[PDB]
Write an enzyme that holds these catalytic residues in place. Structure first.
Site, short mmCIF file in Angstrom:
data_model
loop_
_atom_site.label_atom_id
_atom_site.label_comp_id
_atom_site.label_asym_id
_atom_site.label_seq_id
_atom_site.Cartn_x
_atom_site.Cartn_y
_atom_site.Cartn_z
N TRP A 260 0.85 -1.20 0.00
CA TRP A 260 0.00 0.00 0.00
C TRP A 260 0.89 1.25 0.00
O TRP A 260 0.66 2.17 0.82
CB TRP A 260 -0.97 -0.06 1.20
N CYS B 162 -6.54 -5.34 -1.28
CA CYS B 162 -7.54 -6.34 -0.91
C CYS B 162 -8.44 -6.79 -2.06
O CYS B 162 -8.85 -7.96 -2.04
CB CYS B 162 -8.47 -5.81 0.19
N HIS C 200 -13.58 -2.32 2.21
CA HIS C 200 -12.63 -3.46 2.23
C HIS C 200 -13.30 -4.67 1.57
O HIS C 200 -14.48 -4.84 1.81
CB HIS C 200 -12.20 -3.74 3.63
N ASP D 272 -11.40 -13.91 4.13
CA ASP D 272 -10.69 -12.67 3.74
C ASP D 272 -9.22 -13.04 3.61
O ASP D 272 -8.54 -13.23 4.61
CB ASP D 272 -10.96 -11.63 4.84
N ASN E 215 -18.82 -4.99 13.03
CA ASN E 215 -19.68 -4.56 14.14
C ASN E 215 -18.98 -3.59 15.09
O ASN E 215 -19.61 -3.31 16.12
CB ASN E 215 -20.23 -5.73 14.93
N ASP F 79 -17.51 -0.30 17.13
CA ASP F 79 -18.08 1.04 17.40
C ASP F 79 -16.96 2.09 17.32
O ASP F 79 -15.81 1.74 17.58
CB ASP F 79 -18.58 1.11 18.85
N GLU G 94 -30.31 -2.63 13.52
CA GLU G 94 -29.61 -1.98 14.63
C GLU G 94 -30.62 -1.74 15.74
O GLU G 94 -31.80 -1.50 15.45
CB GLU G 94 -28.91 -0.69 14.18
N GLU H 163 -30.01 -8.41 17.18
CA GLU H 163 -28.74 -7.76 17.32
C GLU H 163 -28.15 -7.73 18.71
O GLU H 163 -26.94 -7.97 18.92
CB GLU H 163 -28.75 -6.34 16.75
N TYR I 232 -7.16 4.66 0.80
CA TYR I 232 -8.52 4.09 0.92
C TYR I 232 -8.71 3.31 2.22
O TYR I 232 -9.89 3.18 2.60
CB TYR I 232 -8.91 3.14 -0.25
CA LIG Z 1 -22.98 -1.23 14.55
#
Ligand SMILES: [Ca+2]
Ligand SMILES: [Ca+2]
EC number: 2.3.2.13
Lengths: 708, 708
Positions: free
Chosen positions: B266, B301, B360, B383, B423, B425, B472, B477, B541
Site C-alpha cells: 500500500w 484487498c 474493504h 478474507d 460490528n 463502534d 440496529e 442484534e 482508501y
Molecule cells: Ca454497529
C-alpha cells in the site's frame, strides 16, 4: 492519483509492534520534582522476587508476576508534595508502544489498589523518598518492559532517561487468582512451574522406560531466549498476555520449517549434519544454540520438541507438563480407524498396510482458563508441537481442551478432532481379496491410547492420566463422547468364531534371546484347523517398519473346549545386525480359521532394554564448591562403538557438556571426570546420555543433595 | 530411512508414480487387451455440456463429482461377462492409496449407486463396451490419471501411462449430494459460470464500480489453481473438502516472503512491480505466478479477492466478492475503534492511530458446514487480506456468515475477527493534559454500515448488509452481541445535553471545488454556545491519513428547539497536488458544547470521481473473426503524465495486454488499437485500466455481443 512524492505507509499508520527486543526513544521533555534514583528491591533474597516466586532465575533484573503487587522506591530532588506534584511510573514495551494496545502503561497513583487494574499506591514517604506498592493488571502483556518515571507540569512532561538497570520482566502468575493461568495448588505450582528437571516416559506400554530431562528454565539466558522465540515469530506484543495465543504461537515455532523455528525434525536414524535427537539431555543448549546461531537446531523428535516447549511454557510462567501417550495414532487426519490389511490366507499384506501407530508419542499440556469456550473447558490444554495434517496444513495442534477432548466436544479450537483421534482410534483388520474387493474382519478398540502418563508431583514416578483424556471403554459417557465427536470433525469412513487367540513377548536386554508364546482358547464344541502367522519386524519407535527379521507359520488343530499354547524362541542373531535407534520390535500374530474363515489378529510391541550410564560423585557437594563427577559407560556389545559422544547435564550443577571417545572396544569402560561447581542448592540431578556411530538412546543419572 | 512415516505425504497433483502394466504374482495368457479408450470429451458433446465444463479452454476431459459421464473402451476382443473381470482406475499423486482416496478402483456395477464410485456397462458392440461412470460426490478435486486394469488369477494387467485420458474432477454445485450444492440455476450461473465480475469501491455515499476478469475458463487457469495447491503442499486427501480448499487457498493468495501469489503493498509507488490499481483481472496474475514460480507484485484487498474468486469458481466452489463500507480491519477482535480528542474538542492526531477503511473487499464461498451445528452452511466469509488472528498475521475464515450474524463466533474459523470487522463502534475519547482519558461518546452506526456484492444477471449492487447483521437496536442484534462477547469478541472500555450534529459533503469530480454542510439540532430548551472544529485529511482508501489539507474552527450559538447550518467551501487548490491513488478524503467534525462540556463528533469520507477510459469497437463481432478495439484515454489534469501504462482485457475476447505511453500532456489523448479475434460468443466485456507515475485508479469498459 496525482502525486505528492515518496513511498507512503498506506496499509497502517503505525508498524506492527511485534518485537520485545526493539525499542523507541522516549523524550525526556514533552522546581518540579526530579528523579535522582530508583530502587527496585530486586536482589534474589528480597521480598519482591521471593514473594513473586522469581528468585530462581539466574537474572539480575527485577522479575515479577502479573496481577500481584511489588515494591519500588523513587528518590526525588526534594520531598514529594501531594499539594503540587504529579508523577507516575510508566512501563513501555516495543518500538511502537501505545496505551490502547497495552504496550505503553502509565501507572496511576491511587489511594488503594484495585483488583484487576494497574495502579501504584504510596505506602511510605520519608524525606525525599517515596515507596510505592505497584500492582500490574492480571491480564498484562508478558515480556521485558522499560521503566520510566514521568513528572507532569504546566509546560509538559519530564521523564527519566533510558535505564537498563530498571528493566522489569513481568511473567504469567499461577499464584494470582485473577490470572488466566491460576493454579490453586501450591504443590502443583512447584512441580508444573518451579521444577526445572523432568522425566520423559518412553519404551512401550508393557515395558515403560524413564529418562531425565533438564528444562532449565531458570538458567542464565533462557528467559531472554523465550522472548526471542516470540520475536522470531513476530508475535504481536498485544497477544503476549494471552496464554492461549502464547501456547499457539510458541508451539508453532518449536518445529522448524525451512530455516525458521527452533528444531529441525528428523527420524532418519543417521543425522549426518546435526546431533541425533537421542543425545540431547535438555532444552538448555538447544535454546541457547537457537538464539546464538539464530538458526534451527538439528535435530529433534517428539520428546525433544516437548522438552523444549515445556521449558518455554514454564519459564514464561504457564504451568506445563509433558504427557506420553502409549500407542499413538499420529497423522490421523481425524479418522478414527487405522487399517491393517490381511491376505485371504490370513497373512498381513505389507504392501497395503502402511499406517503405523507410534509405540509412544509425547506432547504438552499447558494450564489455563478457556474464556473463549463454554464454561468447564479450562484446565489442561493439549498442545502437540510435532506437526501432522490438520484443518490448516502440516502444523502443530492445540491448544485443545483435554476436557473438551474427553467429552467429544471437538468443534472448539484448536485441532481437537486430531488430538481426539490420536487417543481414540480403532484398529480395523480388513481382508484385501485377490479380486480387489475389501472385507472388514474385526475391530480392535483397546490398543490406541491404551495408557497415557506424566511425571508425578512427588518424585520421578509415573502418573497415569489415561482417564483424563477418555472415559472407560464400554460405558455411556465414552459412548456419548464418540457420538458428539462424530458430529464435529471425527470421521469413521468404513462402517462396522468363539476362538480366542493372544500372545506374549518377553522383554530382554539388548543382545539377549527372548521368548514369545501364542495362546488359543477354543470355547466351542467344534474342531478347528487354523493357519496362524507370526511376523516380527524391526521398527522405529513411530511404528514405521524397516524389515521383517522373523517370519513363521503355525498349523494348529483346535480340539473342542481346549486351551493350547505354542512357544517359540527368537535368538539375538535374528535381529542383532538390524536394530534401529530405540531398539523397538513389532509383532503380528494373525490366523485364519479354515472352517469359518474367521480372522483372529493380535499385535504387540517390545523394546530391548538398552545399557545405562553410571554416574558417581566424590568431594564436597556445596554451592560455590568443587565436586568431582565421574561419567561411566561400559559397552557390553561386540562391535567397537565408534565416535562415542557422551553428554553431561544437570540444572544448577553444570551447563550441558559433551565428550567423545574415539572408540570403546567390546566390554571396555570409559570414564570422564568433570569438576563441577554447583550454583543451586538442595535436591539436584546429574544427567548424561551417549550416542555413538551406531548404538545410542543410552541414558544415566545421579541424584545429588547440594548444601548451602 | 524414513522413520517419521511409512509413505511420504501425497501432496502434489503434478507428481506421479508409474503403475505396473503387469503386476503379477504367484505361480504360472490372453485375458482382454484394451486397444483404445474414448472419453467423448469434446466441448460440444454431452459429457462437458451436462457437467457444465464446456467453457474451459482445455482439451482434456473435465467432469464434476457425484455425476455420471460416458466413456468407451475398445478391447482386442469382445468383453465377455462370463469370464472377464475389469475396472477403470483413477489415480492421483506420487503416493496413491485406496484408503486415502487417491487410488480409486471403479467397479463395474449392475446399477449406479448414489454416493459411490461405479461404472455401468450401458452398451456392448463388436469389441467396444460403453460405460457410464459415476464418481463419489466427496471425491478429491484434481487432475486424475486414468487406467484400465484386467484381473487374472495371478494379479493384474493394466494400460500404460496416457496423458490424453487424464481427467479433471471438480466440485459440483449442480449435485444435490455435493457439499457445494447450490439449488438453483440462476445462482449457479452467477457464482460459478460467470467469468466477469464487478468490484464495488469508493465510499458509502458514493459507490464506485469497475469490472474484473475472473477468467476461470481461460487456457492455463485450471492447471494454475492445481499448481497453487501444489505450492501449498496441500495434502491431496484434503482437496475434496471445500472448507479446507478455501482455508489453504486463501492463505496462498497473500505472499509471505517468497511463497504465495501476490505481494501486498500500500505504498503509492510500487517500485519494481505493477500497481495494485492497474490489474484488470486475475488471469495475467495467475499465469505470471505460474511461469515465474514467484510472488507477483503487487496486490491490495480487491486484487487478492479477485484472484481468490477465480481460484474458487475455477475448481467449482461458488464464490462472490463482497465489499464492506467502513471496515474495521486489524481489529484484534476488539469492537471499539478509538479517536483521541484534545480537551478543547479537536482531534488529537498524534494519539489517533487506528483508521477505518473506506471500503474493504473479501470473498464468500458457498458450502455446507458439517463441522458445525446445523444452520451454519451457506456463504462462508474468507478474507485473504491478513490481519492479526488467533494464530498470527494471516487470512481469516472460512467463517459462516450466519454464525457471524448471530454472534456464535466460537465456531471456526476466525469468526471474531470478521464479526468485529463489521460490528465495531467508534469511541471518542478525550485525552486530558494530566494523562487521564475520558470517554465522551460511542457511534455504533459508522462501521459496517453497508455491505454489497454484484447482482445476479446484471452489474448492479445487491445490498447484503442484512446477511451479516440484524437491524440496529433490536433484540436479535443485542442477543448476537451478547453471544459474541462470551466467545471471542471483546469490548475493552466500558461505555447527552440533547444537541445532535451531522454533516454532508458534496461529491466532486477530481479538480472541482465542493461544499460541505454541517447541521446542529438543539432538541433541548436550553440555549447553547459551541466551538466546532473541522479537519480534512488526504488519505489512503484504508483510512490512513497522509496530511491535513484543511482546518476551519468556528463558533455557533444554538437557539432552543432549532437547527443551525454552516456551509464550508473547499476549493480544488486546497487538495490538488496532494492526493493519493483513489483520491480519498476524510472529514472530522468535532464540537464542544461550552455549557455542558458535551462533545459532538462525526466523520465522513469522499472520493473524487476520476476520469473513465473510452473503449470502442468496429468490425464483425463474431467468434473467429477479427475486430478492432479502440481504447482512448484523455488526460483531464493540467499536469503532464509520465510512463502511462494502459491495460486491455476481456475473457474470451482477448488475453490481457498493456502498452506504455512515455508521456501525455495536459488535455491530450492517446489511442491504442488492438485486433482481437474472439473465442467466446454471447454477451462479453472489454475492460481497461490506466496507471501512471502519478494518476492511477482509472478504468473503463465496453459490453459487446459476439456472434457465433
Ligand atoms: Ca454497529
Ligand atoms: Ca478406544
Amino acid at each position: 492519483s496525482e502525486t505528492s512524492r515518496t513511498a507512503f505507509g498506506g496499509r497502517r499508520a503505525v508498524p506492527p509492534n511485534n518485537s520485545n527486543a526493539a525499542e523507541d526513544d522516549l523524550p525526556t521533555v514533552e522546581e518540579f520534582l526530579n528523579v535522582t534514583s530508583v530502587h527496585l528491591f530486586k536482589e534474589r533474597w528480597d521480598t519482591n522476587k521471593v514473594d513473586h516466586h522469581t528468585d530462581k532465575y539466574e537474572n539480575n533484573k527485577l522479575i515479577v508476576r502479573r496481577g500481584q503487587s511489588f515494591y519500588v522506591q523513587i528518590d526525588f530532588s526534594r520531598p514529594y508534595d501531594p499539594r503540587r506534584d504529579l508523577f507516575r511510573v510508566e512501563y513501555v514495551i516495543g518500538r511502537y508502544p501505545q496505551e490502547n494496545k497495552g504496550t505503553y502503561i502509565p501507572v496511576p497513583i491511587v489511594s488503594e489498589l484495585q483488583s484487576g487494574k494497574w495502579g501504584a499506591k504510596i505506602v511510605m514517604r520519608e524525606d525525599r523518598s517515596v515507596r510505592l506498592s505497584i500492582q500490574s493488571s492480571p491480564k498484562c502483556i508478558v515480556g521485558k518492559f522499560r521503566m520510566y518515571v514521568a513528572v507532569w507540569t504546566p509546560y509538559g512532561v519530564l521523564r527519566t532517561s533510558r535505564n537498563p538497570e530498571t528493566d522489569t520482566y513481568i511473567l504469567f502468575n499461577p499464584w494470582c487468582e485473577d490470572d488466566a493461568v491460576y493454579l490453586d495448588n501450591e504443590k502443583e505450582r512447584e512441580e508444573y512451574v518451579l521444577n526445572d528437571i523432568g522425566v520423559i516416559f518412553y519404551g512401550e506400554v508393557n515395558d515403560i522406560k524413564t529418562r531425565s530431562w533438564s528444562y532449565g528454565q531458570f538458567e542464565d539466558g533462557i528467559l531472554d531466549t523465550c522472548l526471542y522465540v516470540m520475536d522470531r515469530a513476530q508475535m504481536d506484543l498485544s497477544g503476549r498476555g494471552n496464554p492461549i495465543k502464547v501456547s499457539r504461537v510458541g508451539s508453532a515455532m518449536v518445529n522448524a520449517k525451512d530455516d525458521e523455528g527452533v528444531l529441525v525434525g528428523s527420524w532418519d536414524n543417521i543425522y549426518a549434519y546435526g546431533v541425533p535427537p537421542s543425545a540431547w539431555t535438555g532444552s538448555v543448549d538447544i535454546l541457547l544454540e537457537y538464539r546464538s546461531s539464530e538458526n534451527p537446531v538439528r535435530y529433534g523428535q517428539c520428546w525433544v520438541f516437548a522438552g523444549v516447549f515445556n521449558t518455554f511454557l514454564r519459564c514464561l510462567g504457564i504451568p506445563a507438563r509433558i504427557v506420553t501417550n502409549y500407542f499413538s495414532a499420529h497423522d490421523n487426519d481425524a479418522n478414527l480407524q487405522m487399517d491393517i490389511f490381511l491376505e485371504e490366507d490370513g497373512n498381513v499384506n505389507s504392501k497395503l498396510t502402511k499406517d503405523s501407530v507410534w509405540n509412544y508419542h509425547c506432547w504438552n499440556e499447558a494450564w489455563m482458563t478457556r474464556p473463549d469456550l463454554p464454561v468447564g473447558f479450562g484446565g489442561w490444554q493439549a498442545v502437540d508441537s510435532t506437526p501432522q495434517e490438520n484443518s490448516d496444513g502440516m502444523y502443530r495442534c492445540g491448544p485443545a481442551s483435554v476436557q473438551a477432548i474427553k467429552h467429544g466436544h471437538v468443534c472448539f479450537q484448536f485441532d481437537a478432532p486430531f488430538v481426539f483421534a490420536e487417543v481414540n482410534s480403532d484398529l480395523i483388520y480388513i481382508t484385501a481379496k485377490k479380486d480387489g474387493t475389501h472385507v472388514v474382519e474385526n475391530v480392535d478398540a483397546t490398543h490406541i491410547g491404551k495408557l497415557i502418563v506424566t511425571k508425578q508431583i512427588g518424585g520421578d514416578g509415573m502418573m497415569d492420566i489415561t482417564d483424563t483424556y477418555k472415559f472407560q471403554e464400554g460405558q455411556e459417557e465414552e459412548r456419548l463422547a464418540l457420538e458428539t465427536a462424530l458430529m464435529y470433525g471425527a470421521k469413521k469412513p468404513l462402517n462396522t468364531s468363539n476362538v480366542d487367540m493372544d500372545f506374549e513377548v518377553e522383554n530382554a536386554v539388548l543382545g539377549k534371546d527372548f521368548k514369545l508364546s501364542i495362546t488359543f482358547r477354543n470355547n466351542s464344541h467344534n474342531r478347528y484347523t487354523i493357519t496362524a502367522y507370526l511376523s516380527a519386524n524391526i521398527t522405529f519407535y513411530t511404528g514405521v517398519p524397516k524389515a521383517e527379521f522373523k517370519k513363521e507359520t503355525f498349523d494348529v488343530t483346535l480340539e473342542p473346549l481346549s486351551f493350547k499354547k505354542e512357544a517359540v524362541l527368537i535368538q539375538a542373531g535374528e535381529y542383532m545386525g538390524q536394530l534401529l535407534e530405540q531398539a523397538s520390535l513389532h509383532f503380528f500374530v494373525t490366523a485364519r480359521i479354515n472352517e469359518t474363515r474367521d480372522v483372529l489378529a493380535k499385535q504387540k510391541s517390545t523394546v530391548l532394554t538398552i545399557p545405562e550410564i553410571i554416574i558417581k560423585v566424590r568431594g564436597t557437594q556445596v554451592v560455590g564448591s568443587d565436586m568431582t563427577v565421574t561419567v561411566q559407560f561400559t559397552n557390553p556389545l561386540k562391535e567397537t562403538l565408534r565416535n562415542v559422544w557422551v553428554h553431561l547435564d544437570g540444572p544448577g550443577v553444570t551447563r550441558p557438556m559433551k565428550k567423545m571417545f574415539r572408540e570403546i572396544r567390546p566390554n571396555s569402560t570409559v570414564q570422564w571426570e568433570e569438576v563441577c561447581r554447583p550454583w543451586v542448592s538442595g535436591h539436584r540431578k546429574l544427567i548424561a546420555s551417549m550416542s555413538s556411530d551406531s548404538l545410542r538412546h543410552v541414558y544415566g543419572e545421579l541424584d545429588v543433595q547440594i548444601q548451602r
